[PDB]
Amino acid sequence: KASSXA
Amino acid sequence: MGILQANRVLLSRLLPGVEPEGLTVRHGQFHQVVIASDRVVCLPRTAAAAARLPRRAAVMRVLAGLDLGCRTPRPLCEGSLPFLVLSRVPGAPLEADALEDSKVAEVVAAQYVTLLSGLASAGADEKVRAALPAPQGRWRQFAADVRAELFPLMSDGGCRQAERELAALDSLPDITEAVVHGNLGAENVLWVRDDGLPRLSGVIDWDEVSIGDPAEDLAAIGAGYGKDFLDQVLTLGGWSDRRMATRIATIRATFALQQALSACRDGDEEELADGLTGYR
Amino acid sequence: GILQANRVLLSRLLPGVEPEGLTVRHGQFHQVVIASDRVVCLPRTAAAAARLPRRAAVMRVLAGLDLGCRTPRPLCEGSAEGAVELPFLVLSRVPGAPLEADALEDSKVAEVVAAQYVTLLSGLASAGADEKVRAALPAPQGRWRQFAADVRAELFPLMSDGGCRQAERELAALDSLPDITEAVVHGNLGAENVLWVRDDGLPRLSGVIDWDEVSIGDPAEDLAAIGAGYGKDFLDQVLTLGGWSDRRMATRIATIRATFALQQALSACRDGDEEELADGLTGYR
Ligand SMILES: Nc1ncnc2c1ncn2[C@@H]1O[C@H](COP(=O)(O)OP(=O)(O)OP(=O)(O)O)[C@@H](O)[C@H]1O
Numbered sequence: 001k002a003s004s005x006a
Numbered sequence: 007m008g009i010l011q012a013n014r015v016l017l018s019r020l021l022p023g024v025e026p027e028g029l030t031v032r033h034g035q036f037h038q039v040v041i042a043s044d045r046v047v048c049l050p051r052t053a054a055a056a057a058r059l060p061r062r063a064a065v066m067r068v069l070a071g072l073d074l075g076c077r078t079p080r081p082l083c084e085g086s087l088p089f090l091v092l093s094r095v096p097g098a099p100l101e102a103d104a105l106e107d108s109k110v111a112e113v114v115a116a117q118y119v120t121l122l123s124g125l126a127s128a129g130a131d132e133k134v135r136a137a138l139p140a141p142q143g144r145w146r147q148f149a150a151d152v153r154a155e156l157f158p159l160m161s162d163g164g165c166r167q168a169e170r171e172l173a174a175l176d177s178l179p180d181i182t183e184a185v186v187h188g189n190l191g192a193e194n195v196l197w198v199r200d201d202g203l204p205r206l207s208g209v210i211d212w213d214e215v216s217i218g219d220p221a222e223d224l225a226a227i228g229a230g231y232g233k234d235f236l237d238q239v240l241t242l243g244g245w246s247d248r249r250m251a252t253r254i255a256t257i258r259a260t261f262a263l264q265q266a267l268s269a270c271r272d273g274d275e276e277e278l279a280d281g282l283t284g285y286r
Numbered sequence: 287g288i289l290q291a292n293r294v295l296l297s298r299l300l301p302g303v304e305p306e307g308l309t310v311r312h313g314q315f316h317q318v319v320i321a322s323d324r325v326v327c328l329p330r331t332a333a334a335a336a337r338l339p340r341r342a343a344v345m346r347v348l349a350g351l352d353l354g355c356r357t358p359r360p361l362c363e364g365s366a367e368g369a370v371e372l373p374f375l376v377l378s379r380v381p382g383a384p385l386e387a388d389a390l391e392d393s394k395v396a397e398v399v400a401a402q403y404v405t406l407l408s409g410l411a412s413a414g415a416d417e418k419v420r421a422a423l424p425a426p427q428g429r430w431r432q433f434a435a436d437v438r439a440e441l442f443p444l445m446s447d448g449g450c451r452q453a454e455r456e457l458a459a460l461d462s463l464p465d466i467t468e469a470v471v472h473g474n475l476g477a478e479n480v481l482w483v484r485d486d487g488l489p490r491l492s493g494v495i496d497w498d499e500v501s502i503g504d505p506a507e508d509l510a511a512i513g514a515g516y517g518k519d520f521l522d523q524v525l526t527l528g529g530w531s532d533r534r535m536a537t538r539i540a541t542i543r544a545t546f547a548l549q550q551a552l553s554a555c556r557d558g559d560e561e562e563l564a565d566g567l568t569g570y571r
Pocket residue numbers: 001032033034035036037038039046078079092093094095096210211212213214
């Protein structure tokens with residue numbers, strides 16, 4: 001569950 | 007009233023004598039997190055996360071008993087509005103610029119390998135396996151949410167490109183070998199600096215944690231720090247086979263769409279726009 | 287010194303850290319090098335190095351208990367537990383500072399500090415009822431009898447005739463103590479090993495350090511330490527709040543408390559700490 005491009 | 011004023015009975019119990027108006031509250035997807043000098047208080051922001059919070063505590067306790075070469079947030083107190091007090095991991099994220107110095111890069115890559123090895127080993131322990139989420143079809147669920155929720159927002163070529171990325175993704179093995187952090191971005195890895203070279207202090211934000219494929223954590227590292235640095239980590243840890251490189255590439259190419267899928271459900275317009283860049 | 291003689295290994299473990307900026311705590315088996323965020327245990331002998339694999343395991347078990355506070359977390363890989371011998375063991379460093387008894391003169395401070403000692407001791411107690419903790423920790427039998435022997439053998443030679451007579455008084459009751467193996471027992475829970483963050487408000491328990499003497503044993507040993515450091519009234523508040531104020535427990539505490547300076551002198555004697563030996567032997571020479 002990558003947030004903001006990770 | 008603020009979150010601080012509103013929660014003040016609980017805060018004077020957990021933080022006796024601490025002025026609430028002097029604290030800070032960070033928000034996340036599921037939790038309002040009150041930040042004190044050496045600990046945080048996690049509070050659910052929904053009825054969903056209030057019910058899940060016991061299990062999250064249980065998971066954090068398991069993580070606190072692993073050998074990862076660094077700290078994790080240790081559960082110090084849990085209760086019912088449920089709360090969970092965790093130790094605050096000290097330090098700050100590493101600026102990508104620090105990796106210019108090749109002695110810093112070596113030491114940092116070394117500490118990443120220790121962490122990833124620890125997570126890998128930990129996934130082989132039946133107990134951890136028994137306590138941690140291990141979803142099957144995590145990506146087919148993803149692909150269906152993207153088609154449903156994002157395709158209507160996309161150009162025809164956007165949809166074509168996304169379709170190609172989701173195809174690759176459907177061809178990955180449903181590996182459940184390692185403990186996978188799930189969101190191992192730079193801001194979730196804290197360091198001690200200014201005492202010689204950087205030392206890995208610890209890792210935070212374990213809400214995405216699962217038994218899974220470690221390529222997901224390696225992809226996140228490369229997204230934050232770039233390809234030379236990830237090559238260094240992959241080479242030091244003996245993970246630079248082409249099968250691993252395929253899994254990493256496949257997963258990384260989903261990062262823009264994951265952000266867009268979150269920002270869609272959030273109502274966050276700037277993240278959605280950024281996520282959809284080039285898909286419309 | 288230790289820092290000098292171990293500069294190369296320390297330059298590897300703490301790269302770029304000036305080793306003259308580090309401090310050393312003296313242990314029976316290992317010397318402990320104190321850095322800003324971590325500590326490094328250095329075996330003093332081949333025997334000491336062969337004990338670190340099990341110490342690694344022990345510290346991992348402690349890092350998993352529900353104590354309401356932190357402990358030194360092992361920073362090795364789990365496979366270090368299966369080794370014959372380790373040349374070092376690195377542990378996280380618990381932040382905070384010891385608490386001066388002075389603070390306990392304000393009665394709200396005292397209540398809040400007693401409550402946090404109770405959470406710690408209650409967690410140690412319940413962990414001692416757990417068969418998997420029990421299997422991973424040492425649980426010597428006849429420890430009081432043997433300790434009395436060890437005092438007579440190692441400390442009496444350092445004592446005056448008066449000192450020896452006083453020690454004999456205190457060692458008297460030990461053979462009659464029941465031999466209780468029910469709790470995880472830190473075994474050196476003086477105020478210097480219990481660390482507090484007092485900046486933001488009332489004293490908050492950061493954590494506990496120096497677990498060299500940990501075992502499955504008698505909770506009265508840890509309460510004795512508290513009483514030795516803080517005196518009767520503070521102890522009574524801990525016992526009341528913890529549910530431990532019964533006559534049986536209280537009598538064991540009194541007996542153990544009367545040997546607590548001798549415990550400190552015996553440890554200082556075996557670990558080479560001259561100041562701690564002089565302190566511990568106060569009034570026995
Ligand atoms: N243990 C910790 N130590 C230090 N800072 C922490 C800790 N836990 C949380 N934080 C801080 O609080 C912020 C919000 O917490 P976190 O990212 O865990 O949110 P969440 O809503 O629980 O997670 P998620 O969005 O993944 O479901 C972090 O970005 C970080 O600044």
